[model samples]
Target: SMEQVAMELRLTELTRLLRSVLDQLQDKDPARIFAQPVSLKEVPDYLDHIKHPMDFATMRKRLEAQGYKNLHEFEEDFDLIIDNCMKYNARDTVFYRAAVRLRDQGGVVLRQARREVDSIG
Candidate 1:
């Protein structure tokens, strides 16, 4: 087989994998912790510390636009969602607890999703 369609096929499979993982993340998130961007109107100093904000809604749009060329870019956004929460909220805060749980779950979800698409080429 030639390498002609290899890149295209990989992109398609990678998109599928990304979609699946994002759906799983949104489905399992009952509180909508990572669904949308944090509202600056709701909080005054969020962007002051979290310079690079990210969320599932943004990721969904980016994923559809094929803005992400690889899994690492998507992962960085996912992790940023958690990183923002952990950085802005204290260890005793409810957001911190939720972020930790999300991080652990993301670890498993990302790994399995990556495995599912590893043979696309």
Candidate 2:
């Protein structure tokens, strides 16, 4: 079927790009890598559930305390991760371009969930 073929092509491309991202991290300890493989589709949704401050300086200070010599290392890591996710599919591409939605929707989703549970009572 055309749909199957299309999905297979997407998966193949995703795997290829994932391998490229892994290549960039080769110098790091294997133990430091993700405990399980995450598909590009999952990246934004995963990020959405987390709570974070609205600015980068706090994050920068944390990284500095962790021994990141400068901001470039964190930037490089984020670039590689975002680039790989963008290569996956249209939805994943939105993960990078739709920053406002990504940042806000988690709260929105959680709020909607609360409404759902409240209505069920």
Candidate 3:
């Protein structure tokens, strides 16, 4: 029973993730045309690939990998992007600005999610 449940959960997670990647590419094209690592100068392509509603699970895993376990630290790191990306008004600049703003707003969202996750303990 446990194994079946876990398998189904994993499949559901995979399907959701695939759908998210597709959705990110829904509005724009892929960034493969860029020869260099995608940067703010390449928003039209890179932003097209950014996952929407931005999955917190992925963010948690990423931040945890970087030894971040709290919202404060994540917020501080994200703040740097806002400080730097706000100075531009180009397509890529807008993209970075929007992303940083989302991260700033997401500070509270992550805390709430963490509380919900802790409740399962």
Candidate 4:
């Protein structure tokens, strides 16, 4: 139930944020509707910050910095974060933090994807 709640809250926040962003871009350059929503790029950025990640806090901060308002929606990003985490051999705080970081970044990617889909449909 917690996971479901978290997931729903995350998605709701992301959807709200994305809707706001889209509304703001309605009269602007459609190409600039959303910033580059890429979790792959965010992967190393957050990882590079901590040699030994203390906890999820580091990840939470970095993800928030990267503009991921949601924590659960990343399926649209194509799991770049998960792939990197699995492949990354660090196996320390960096690895786990990187995983959450990817999730955070994926949140942004997911938001953009939803917006793109909305525009398409």
List pairs with backbone clashes in candidate 2: none
Point out the higher-scoring one by TM-score: 2 or 3.
Answer: 3
- Ordered list by TM-score, greatest first: 1, 3, 4, 2
**In candidate 3, which residue pairs clash?**
none
lDDT of 2 by residue, 60-90 (tens): 3434344332224444443444344344435
**lDDT of candidate 1 over 1-121, digit per residue (tens):** 6585887777776888788888887765678977888888898788889999998999999998867888888889998989989999999988889899988877888887676656553
**What tens-digit string does per-residue lDDT give for candidate 3 at 1-121?**
9998986665555444433432332223132211123354746554554322222344344443544433355445444333333433354654555645554554555566446434632
Better of 2 and 3 by lDDT: 3
lDDT of each: 0.84, 0.39, 0.42, 0.45
* TM-score for candidate 2, residues paired by index: 0.26
Residue runs of model 4 more than 4 Å from their true location after superposition:
1-77, 80-92
lDDT of 4 by residue, 11-119 (tens): 5666555445433432232332123333435565645642332222233344445445443332323244345444444556554555555556545655676676456
TM-score of each: 0.87, 0.26, 0.32, 0.28
lDDT of 2 at 41: 75
How many clashing residue pairs, candidate 3? Answer: 0
